[model samples]
Target: NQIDLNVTCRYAGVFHVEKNGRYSISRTEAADLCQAFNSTLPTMDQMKLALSKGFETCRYGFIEGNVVIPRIHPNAICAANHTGVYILVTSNTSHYDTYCFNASAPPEEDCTSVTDLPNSFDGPVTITIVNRDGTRYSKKGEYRTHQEDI
Candidate 1:
Protein backbone atom coordinates (compact mmCIF):
# COMPACT_ATOMS: atom_id res chain seq x y z
CA ASN A 1 0.00 0.00 0.00
CA GLN A 2 1.12 3.51 -0.69
CA ILE A 3 0.19 6.83 0.81
CA ASP A 4 0.51 10.11 -1.03
CA LEU A 5 1.32 13.17 1.08
CA ASN A 6 0.59 16.60 -0.32
CA VAL A 7 3.16 19.27 0.47
CA THR A 8 3.04 23.07 0.42
CA CYS A 9 4.70 26.10 2.02
CA ARG A 10 3.27 28.10 4.90
CA TYR A 11 5.13 31.01 6.47
CA ALA A 12 8.17 31.55 8.66
CA GLY A 13 7.86 33.08 12.11
CA VAL A 14 8.72 32.90 15.79
CA PHE A 15 6.26 31.03 17.98
CA HIS A 16 6.24 31.42 21.71
CA VAL A 17 3.74 30.32 24.33
CA GLU A 18 4.11 31.98 27.68
CA LYS A 19 3.21 30.69 31.13
CA ASN A 20 0.40 33.21 31.32
CA GLY A 21 -1.38 31.26 28.54
CA ARG A 22 -0.48 33.53 25.69
CA TYR A 23 0.83 32.40 22.31
CA SER A 24 2.55 34.71 19.89
CA ILE A 25 3.88 34.50 16.33
CA SER A 26 6.17 36.96 14.66
CA ARG A 27 7.56 37.15 11.16
CA THR A 28 10.82 38.63 12.36
CA GLU A 29 13.70 36.15 12.80
CA ALA A 30 11.47 33.39 11.49
CA ALA A 31 13.85 32.54 8.70
CA ASP A 32 16.91 32.44 10.90
CA LEU A 33 15.20 30.15 13.38
CA CYS A 34 13.71 27.90 10.71
CA GLN A 35 17.13 27.49 9.12
CA ALA A 36 18.00 25.20 12.01
CA PHE A 37 15.33 22.76 10.79
CA ASN A 38 16.31 23.16 7.13
CA SER A 39 12.76 24.48 6.55
CA THR A 40 10.39 27.17 7.67
CA LEU A 41 8.17 27.06 10.80
CA PRO A 42 5.42 25.35 8.78
CA THR A 43 3.56 25.68 5.53
CA MET A 44 -0.22 25.72 5.28
CA ASP A 45 -0.42 22.11 4.24
CA GLN A 46 2.03 21.06 6.93
CA MET A 47 0.08 22.95 9.54
CA LYS A 48 -3.13 21.35 8.31
CA LEU A 49 -1.61 17.89 8.57
CA ALA A 50 -0.33 18.72 12.01
CA LEU A 51 -3.73 19.97 13.09
CA SER A 52 -5.27 16.78 11.83
CA LYS A 53 -3.05 14.82 14.18
CA GLY A 54 -2.98 17.45 16.88
CA PHE A 55 -3.54 16.95 20.58
CA GLU A 56 -4.57 19.52 23.10
CA THR A 57 -2.48 20.73 26.05
CA CYS A 58 -3.74 20.34 29.60
CA ARG A 59 -2.60 20.20 33.17
CA TYR A 60 -1.95 17.09 35.26
CA GLY A 61 -1.19 16.25 38.86
CA PHE A 62 -0.24 13.21 40.83
CA ILE A 63 -2.22 11.82 43.76
CA GLU A 64 -1.24 9.54 46.59
CA GLY A 65 -1.57 6.20 44.82
CA ASN A 66 -2.60 7.21 41.32
CA VAL A 67 -1.71 9.87 38.80
CA VAL A 68 -3.51 12.00 36.27
CA ILE A 69 -1.78 12.78 33.03
CA PRO A 70 -2.12 14.83 29.93
CA ARG A 71 -0.89 13.66 26.54
CA ILE A 72 2.53 12.07 26.26
CA HIS A 73 4.91 11.96 23.28
CA PRO A 74 3.63 15.09 21.56
CA ASN A 75 5.13 15.45 18.08
CA ALA A 76 4.77 16.76 14.56
CA ILE A 77 6.49 14.59 11.98
CA CYS A 78 6.61 15.48 8.30
CA ALA A 79 7.99 13.64 5.31
CA ALA A 80 9.50 15.00 2.12
CA ASN A 81 10.51 12.80 -0.82
CA HIS A 82 9.58 9.83 1.37
CA THR A 83 12.04 11.00 4.01
CA GLY A 84 10.83 12.11 7.40
CA VAL A 85 11.85 14.89 9.75
CA TYR A 86 10.61 14.74 13.29
CA ILE A 87 9.74 17.75 15.44
CA LEU A 88 9.24 16.92 19.08
CA VAL A 89 8.62 18.94 22.25
CA THR A 90 8.20 17.78 25.83
CA SER A 91 7.75 19.48 29.18
CA ASN A 92 9.77 19.53 32.40
CA THR A 93 9.39 20.90 35.92
CA SER A 94 12.57 22.85 36.77
CA HIS A 95 13.65 23.90 33.26
CA TYR A 96 11.87 25.15 30.19
CA ASP A 97 10.48 22.80 27.57
CA THR A 98 12.95 21.16 25.15
CA TYR A 99 12.84 20.40 21.43
CA CYS A 100 14.68 18.21 18.94
CA PHE A 101 14.58 17.69 15.18
CA ASN A 102 16.04 14.89 13.05
CA ALA A 103 15.61 13.34 9.62
CA SER A 104 15.30 9.73 8.44
CA ALA A 105 15.02 8.36 4.92
CA PRO A 106 14.38 4.85 3.74
CA PRO A 107 17.18 2.79 2.26
CA GLU A 108 17.21 2.01 -1.45
CA GLU A 109 17.41 -1.59 -2.61
CA ASP A 110 17.26 -3.68 -5.77
CA CYS A 111 13.67 -4.72 -6.41
CA THR A 112 14.61 -7.24 -9.07
CA SER A 113 16.54 -9.54 -6.73
CA VAL A 114 16.20 -9.56 -2.97
CA THR A 115 16.83 -12.03 -0.19
CA ASP A 116 15.09 -10.39 2.78
CA LEU A 117 13.17 -7.19 2.89
CA PRO A 118 14.08 -4.26 5.08
CA ASN A 119 12.00 -3.33 8.08
CA SER A 120 9.84 -0.40 7.24
CA PHE A 121 9.76 0.84 10.83
CA ASP A 122 13.43 0.23 11.52
CA GLY A 123 13.81 3.88 12.36
CA PRO A 124 11.63 6.92 12.87
CA VAL A 125 12.34 10.64 13.18
CA THR A 126 14.39 11.68 16.24
CA ILE A 127 14.78 15.00 18.05
CA THR A 128 17.20 15.95 20.87
CA ILE A 129 17.26 19.00 23.10
CA VAL A 130 20.25 20.54 24.83
CA ASN A 131 20.72 23.36 27.29
CA ARG A 132 22.79 26.53 26.87
CA ASP A 133 25.67 25.07 28.90
CA GLY A 134 25.72 21.98 26.62
CA THR A 135 23.77 19.72 28.93
CA ARG A 136 21.27 17.07 27.82
CA TYR A 137 17.71 17.38 29.16
CA SER A 138 14.91 15.09 28.02
CA LYS A 139 13.68 13.12 24.99
CA LYS A 140 10.58 11.63 23.31
CA GLY A 141 9.88 8.93 20.70
CA GLU A 142 7.52 8.49 17.72
CA TYR A 143 7.01 5.80 15.07
CA ARG A 144 4.52 4.00 12.90
CA THR A 145 2.92 1.07 14.68
CA HIS A 146 3.41 -2.49 13.50
CA GLN A 147 -0.01 -2.52 11.84
CA GLU A 148 0.80 0.66 9.94
CA ASP A 149 4.43 -0.21 9.13
CA ILE A 150 3.59 -3.00 6.72
Candidate 2:
Protein backbone atom coordinates (compact mmCIF):
# COMPACT_ATOMS: atom_id res chain seq x y z
CA ASN A 1 0.00 0.00 0.00
CA GLN A 2 3.02 2.28 0.33
CA ILE A 3 4.34 1.99 -3.25
CA ASP A 4 3.43 0.27 -6.49
CA LEU A 5 4.98 -2.63 -8.36
CA ASN A 6 8.15 -1.87 -10.46
CA VAL A 7 9.06 1.35 -8.71
CA THR A 8 12.39 2.30 -7.14
CA CYS A 9 12.37 2.04 -3.32
CA ARG A 10 9.26 -0.06 -3.69
CA TYR A 11 11.39 -2.86 -2.32
CA ALA A 12 12.79 -1.01 0.61
CA GLY A 13 11.55 -4.23 2.12
CA VAL A 14 10.77 -2.47 5.34
CA PHE A 15 7.00 -2.77 5.39
CA HIS A 16 4.07 -3.22 7.74
CA VAL A 17 1.77 -6.19 8.19
CA GLU A 18 -1.33 -6.19 10.32
CA LYS A 19 -3.34 -8.98 11.89
CA ASN A 20 -7.08 -9.67 11.92
CA GLY A 21 -7.60 -6.82 14.38
CA ARG A 22 -5.71 -4.49 16.68
CA TYR A 23 -3.19 -5.87 19.20
CA SER A 24 -3.22 -9.41 17.93
CA ILE A 25 0.54 -9.98 17.91
CA SER A 26 2.75 -10.91 20.84
CA ARG A 27 6.52 -10.44 20.90
CA THR A 28 7.31 -13.94 19.72
CA GLU A 29 4.46 -13.83 17.23
CA ALA A 30 5.84 -10.62 15.71
CA ALA A 31 9.21 -12.29 15.38
CA ASP A 32 7.68 -15.42 13.93
CA LEU A 33 5.25 -13.53 11.68
CA CYS A 34 8.12 -11.87 9.83
CA GLN A 35 9.31 -15.29 8.81
CA ALA A 36 5.93 -16.02 7.29
CA PHE A 37 6.48 -12.99 5.03
CA ASN A 38 10.04 -13.99 4.12
CA SER A 39 11.41 -11.26 6.32
CA THR A 40 12.69 -10.67 9.84
CA LEU A 41 11.86 -8.33 12.65
CA PRO A 42 13.61 -5.04 11.96
CA THR A 43 16.04 -3.09 14.08
CA MET A 44 15.71 0.56 14.97
CA ASP A 45 18.28 1.41 12.33
CA GLN A 46 16.40 -0.66 9.79
CA MET A 47 13.27 1.19 10.82
CA LYS A 48 15.26 4.35 10.22
CA LEU A 49 15.91 3.17 6.69
CA ALA A 50 12.19 2.58 6.22
CA LEU A 51 11.48 6.10 7.42
CA SER A 52 14.02 7.42 4.94
CA LYS A 53 12.17 5.57 2.20
CA GLY A 54 8.96 7.27 3.36
CA PHE A 55 7.47 4.01 4.60
CA GLU A 56 5.78 5.37 7.65
CA THR A 57 2.40 5.29 9.36
CA CYS A 58 0.85 6.02 12.72
CA ARG A 59 0.05 2.39 13.23
CA TYR A 60 2.29 1.16 16.02
CA GLY A 61 4.07 -2.06 15.07
CA PHE A 62 6.63 -4.19 16.88
CA ILE A 63 10.21 -4.16 15.70
CA GLU A 64 13.02 -6.46 16.73
CA GLY A 65 13.96 -4.67 19.90
CA ASN A 66 10.27 -4.02 20.41
CA VAL A 67 10.72 -0.27 19.86
CA VAL A 68 8.01 0.09 17.26
CA ILE A 69 9.11 2.29 14.28
CA PRO A 70 10.94 5.46 13.41
CA ARG A 71 8.23 8.10 13.16
CA ILE A 72 10.27 11.26 12.58
CA HIS A 73 7.21 13.39 12.14
CA PRO A 74 5.79 13.92 15.58
CA ASN A 75 2.03 14.11 16.07
CA ALA A 76 -0.43 14.31 18.92
CA ILE A 77 -2.30 11.19 17.99
CA CYS A 78 0.60 8.91 17.04
CA ALA A 79 3.39 10.14 19.32
CA ALA A 80 3.20 13.29 21.34
CA ASN A 81 5.21 16.49 20.80
CA HIS A 82 8.36 14.86 19.41
CA THR A 83 9.28 11.83 17.37
CA GLY A 84 12.48 9.79 17.36
CA VAL A 85 11.50 6.17 17.64
CA TYR A 86 8.74 6.48 20.21
CA ILE A 87 7.62 3.69 22.55
CA LEU A 88 4.32 2.52 24.00
CA VAL A 89 5.74 1.82 27.48
CA THR A 90 4.51 -1.72 27.39
CA SER A 91 6.01 -5.17 27.80
CA ASN A 92 7.12 -7.29 24.87
CA THR A 93 4.58 -9.90 25.95
CA SER A 94 1.86 -7.50 24.90
CA HIS A 95 0.58 -7.21 21.33
CA TYR A 96 0.97 -4.83 18.39
CA ASP A 97 1.20 -4.74 14.61
CA THR A 98 4.16 -6.34 12.83
CA TYR A 99 6.91 -4.34 11.15
CA CYS A 100 9.47 -6.40 9.25
CA PHE A 101 12.43 -5.90 6.93
CA ASN A 102 14.03 -8.12 4.36
CA ALA A 103 17.48 -7.40 2.97
CA SER A 104 16.29 -8.40 -0.52
CA ALA A 105 13.14 -9.22 -2.45
CA PRO A 106 12.32 -11.76 -5.10
CA PRO A 107 11.54 -10.73 -8.68
CA GLU A 108 7.92 -9.72 -9.11
CA GLU A 109 6.00 -12.17 -11.28
CA ASP A 110 2.37 -11.25 -11.82
CA CYS A 111 0.17 -14.03 -13.15
CA THR A 112 -0.65 -12.36 -16.46
CA SER A 113 1.07 -14.44 -19.09
CA VAL A 114 0.31 -17.69 -20.96
CA THR A 115 3.32 -19.03 -22.79
CA ASP A 116 2.81 -21.47 -25.65
CA LEU A 117 2.24 -24.93 -24.24
CA PRO A 118 3.88 -27.97 -25.83
CA ASN A 119 1.98 -29.18 -28.82
CA SER A 120 0.60 -32.52 -27.67
CA PHE A 121 -1.16 -33.90 -30.74
CA ASP A 122 -3.12 -36.19 -28.41
CA GLY A 123 -6.74 -36.50 -27.26
CA PRO A 124 -8.85 -33.95 -25.32
CA VAL A 125 -6.53 -31.07 -26.09
CA THR A 126 -8.00 -27.73 -25.01
CA ILE A 127 -6.52 -24.21 -25.35
CA THR A 128 -8.21 -21.40 -23.55
CA ILE A 129 -7.18 -17.72 -23.33
CA VAL A 130 -9.80 -16.22 -21.14
CA ASN A 131 -9.48 -12.37 -20.75
CA ARG A 132 -7.32 -9.22 -20.20
CA ASP A 133 -7.39 -5.79 -18.40
CA GLY A 134 -4.66 -2.19 -17.34
CA THR A 135 -1.88 -0.09 -15.66
CA ARG A 136 -3.98 1.17 -12.74
CA TYR A 137 -5.47 -2.33 -12.39
CA SER A 138 -4.69 -6.07 -12.62
CA LYS A 139 -6.56 -9.34 -13.09
CA LYS A 140 -5.22 -12.89 -12.85
CA GLY A 141 -6.61 -16.29 -13.80
CA GLU A 142 -5.33 -19.79 -14.59
CA TYR A 143 -6.26 -22.20 -17.42
CA ARG A 144 -6.01 -25.98 -17.52
CA THR A 145 -6.93 -28.93 -19.75
CA HIS A 146 -6.78 -32.67 -19.22
CA GLN A 147 -4.58 -34.50 -21.71
CA GLU A 148 -3.11 -37.41 -19.79
CA ASP A 149 -4.64 -40.82 -19.03
CA ILE A 150 -6.98 -40.69 -16.03
Candidate 3:
Protein backbone atom coordinates (compact mmCIF):
# COMPACT_ATOMS: atom_id res chain seq x y z
CA ASN A 1 0.00 0.00 0.00
CA GLN A 2 1.29 3.41 -0.92
CA ILE A 3 1.22 5.87 1.95
CA ASP A 4 0.10 9.34 1.04
CA LEU A 5 2.57 11.96 2.19
CA ASN A 6 -0.05 14.71 1.64
CA VAL A 7 2.68 17.31 1.95
CA THR A 8 4.24 19.41 -0.77
CA CYS A 9 7.83 18.50 0.07
CA ARG A 10 9.51 15.11 0.16
CA TYR A 11 12.11 13.39 2.30
CA ALA A 12 15.37 15.27 1.90
CA GLY A 13 17.68 13.16 4.12
CA VAL A 14 18.38 12.02 7.61
CA PHE A 15 18.64 14.76 10.20
CA HIS A 16 20.86 15.12 13.34
CA VAL A 17 22.50 11.82 14.21
CA GLU A 18 25.90 10.76 15.51
CA LYS A 19 28.67 11.91 13.24
CA ASN A 20 32.46 11.47 13.60
CA GLY A 21 31.84 9.51 16.83
CA ARG A 22 29.95 12.29 18.52
CA TYR A 23 27.24 11.75 21.19
CA SER A 24 23.53 11.20 20.59
CA ILE A 25 21.22 14.24 20.42
CA SER A 26 18.20 15.05 22.56
CA ARG A 27 14.60 15.07 21.27
CA THR A 28 14.10 18.80 21.90
CA GLU A 29 17.38 19.59 20.16
CA ALA A 30 16.45 17.37 17.26
CA ALA A 31 13.06 19.04 16.94
CA ASP A 32 14.75 22.44 16.83
CA LEU A 33 17.20 21.24 14.23
CA CYS A 34 14.36 19.95 12.07
CA GLN A 35 12.71 23.35 12.31
CA ALA A 36 15.98 24.93 11.22
CA PHE A 37 15.77 22.82 8.05
CA ASN A 38 12.17 24.03 7.49
CA SER A 39 10.91 20.64 8.59
CA THR A 40 9.29 19.03 11.59
CA LEU A 41 9.62 15.79 13.53
CA PRO A 42 8.10 12.88 11.64
CA THR A 43 4.97 11.32 13.03
CA MET A 44 4.58 7.63 13.95
CA ASP A 45 2.48 6.95 10.89
CA GLN A 46 5.06 8.65 8.73
CA MET A 47 7.87 6.57 10.26
CA LYS A 48 5.83 3.43 9.63
CA LEU A 49 5.43 4.46 6.02
CA ALA A 50 9.19 4.95 5.76
CA LEU A 51 9.76 1.49 7.26
CA SER A 52 7.38 -0.02 4.75
CA LYS A 53 9.39 1.65 2.01
CA GLY A 54 12.59 -0.13 3.23
CA PHE A 55 13.85 2.54 5.60
CA GLU A 56 15.99 0.74 8.15
CA THR A 57 18.51 2.14 10.64
CA CYS A 58 20.08 0.45 13.61
CA ARG A 59 20.09 3.63 15.67
CA TYR A 60 17.07 4.72 17.68
CA GLY A 61 15.11 7.85 16.77
CA PHE A 62 12.41 9.93 18.39
CA ILE A 63 9.00 9.74 16.69
CA GLU A 64 5.58 11.22 17.40
CA GLY A 65 4.07 7.86 18.30
CA ASN A 66 0.93 8.56 20.35
CA VAL A 67 3.29 10.36 22.69
CA VAL A 68 6.93 11.01 21.89
CA ILE A 69 8.82 7.66 21.90
CA PRO A 70 12.06 6.29 20.56
CA ARG A 71 11.70 3.86 17.67
CA ILE A 72 14.42 1.32 18.15
CA HIS A 73 15.90 -1.62 16.30
CA PRO A 74 15.30 -4.95 17.91
CA ASN A 75 18.34 -5.91 19.99
CA ALA A 76 19.39 -6.73 23.55
CA ILE A 77 18.53 -3.27 24.81
CA CYS A 78 15.17 -3.38 23.05
CA ALA A 79 14.21 -6.96 23.93
CA ALA A 80 11.84 -5.87 26.69
CA ASN A 81 9.48 -4.07 24.32
CA HIS A 82 10.41 -5.47 20.96
CA THR A 83 7.54 -5.74 18.47
CA GLY A 84 9.49 -8.41 16.50
CA VAL A 85 10.78 -5.56 14.34
CA TYR A 86 10.86 -2.30 16.31
CA ILE A 87 11.47 -1.39 19.95
CA LEU A 88 10.20 1.53 21.97
CA VAL A 89 11.86 3.74 24.55
CA THR A 90 10.50 6.52 26.70
CA SER A 91 10.68 9.96 25.08
CA ASN A 92 12.32 12.04 27.83
CA THR A 93 14.41 9.14 29.16
CA SER A 94 17.13 8.90 26.49
CA HIS A 95 18.49 10.83 23.52
CA TYR A 96 18.58 9.76 19.86
CA ASP A 97 18.28 11.07 16.33
CA THR A 98 15.10 12.80 15.23
CA TYR A 99 13.48 11.98 11.90
CA CYS A 100 12.55 15.24 10.17
CA PHE A 101 9.92 15.80 7.46
CA ASN A 102 10.57 18.58 4.93
CA ALA A 103 7.62 20.55 3.59
CA SER A 104 9.35 23.29 1.61
CA ALA A 105 8.40 23.96 -2.01
CA PRO A 106 10.81 22.95 -4.74
CA PRO A 107 12.88 25.42 -6.75
CA GLU A 108 11.34 27.23 -9.72
CA GLU A 109 12.46 27.06 -13.34
CA ASP A 110 12.66 30.14 -15.59
CA CYS A 111 12.26 28.49 -19.00
CA THR A 112 8.72 27.53 -19.96
CA SER A 113 8.56 27.34 -23.77
CA VAL A 114 10.09 28.85 -26.88
CA THR A 115 8.14 31.44 -28.94
CA ASP A 116 8.61 33.16 -32.35
CA LEU A 117 11.28 30.63 -33.32
CA PRO A 118 11.41 29.47 -36.95
CA ASN A 119 11.02 25.75 -37.73
CA SER A 120 14.21 25.97 -39.81
CA PHE A 121 16.64 28.21 -37.98
CA ASP A 122 19.96 29.43 -39.40
CA GLY A 123 21.89 28.96 -36.16
CA PRO A 124 21.43 27.08 -32.89
CA VAL A 125 18.06 27.08 -31.06
CA THR A 126 17.18 25.77 -27.63
CA ILE A 127 13.87 24.29 -26.44
CA THR A 128 12.96 23.74 -22.83
CA ILE A 129 10.10 22.06 -21.02
CA VAL A 130 9.25 22.41 -17.34
CA ASN A 131 7.17 19.97 -15.36
CA ARG A 132 4.56 20.86 -12.76
CA ASP A 133 6.81 19.50 -10.02
CA GLY A 134 9.61 21.92 -11.00
CA THR A 135 11.70 19.47 -13.06
CA ARG A 136 13.06 20.69 -16.39
CA TYR A 137 14.17 19.09 -19.67
CA SER A 138 16.00 20.98 -22.40
CA LYS A 139 17.14 20.27 -25.96
CA LYS A 140 19.45 22.20 -28.27
CA GLY A 141 19.41 22.03 -32.07
CA GLU A 142 22.05 23.40 -34.44
CA TYR A 143 21.42 24.23 -38.13
CA ARG A 144 24.61 25.38 -39.80
CA THR A 145 22.99 25.18 -43.28
CA HIS A 146 19.48 24.32 -44.57
CA GLN A 147 20.35 20.62 -44.24
CA GLU A 148 18.89 20.31 -40.70
CA ASP A 149 15.01 20.06 -40.53
CA ILE A 150 12.73 20.68 -37.54
| lDDT by residue (tens digit), candidate 1, 108-147 | 2111211111222233333232322333322233223333
As for candidate 3, its clashing pairs are none
The parts of candidate 1 lying over 4 Å away from their true place are: 1-25, 55-150
> How would the candidate models be sorted by lDDT, starting from the highest?
2, 3, 1
Root-mean-square deviation per candidate: 19.5, 12.9, 18.6
Whole-model Cα lDDT of every candidate shown, in order: 0.23, 0.50, 0.40
C-alpha-based local distance difference test score of model 2: 0.50
Write candidate 2's Cα lDDT for 92-129 as tens digits. Answer: 45667767676664223223322222222233423232
Error of 3 at 115 (Å): 35
Query: Could you give me the TM-score of model 3 versus the true structure?
Result: 0.43
Q: Tell me the lDDT of model 2 at 98.
A: 69
TM-score, candidate 1, is 0.25
Candidate structures ordered by TM-score, highest first? 2, 3, 1
Write candidate 3's Cα lDDT for 24-128 as tens digits.
445565555355345567776655554443444444555554323233454554434453225454445565555555443222312232221122222344433
Q: Among all windows of ten consecutive residues in candidate 3, which has the lowest summed lDDT?
A: 1-10
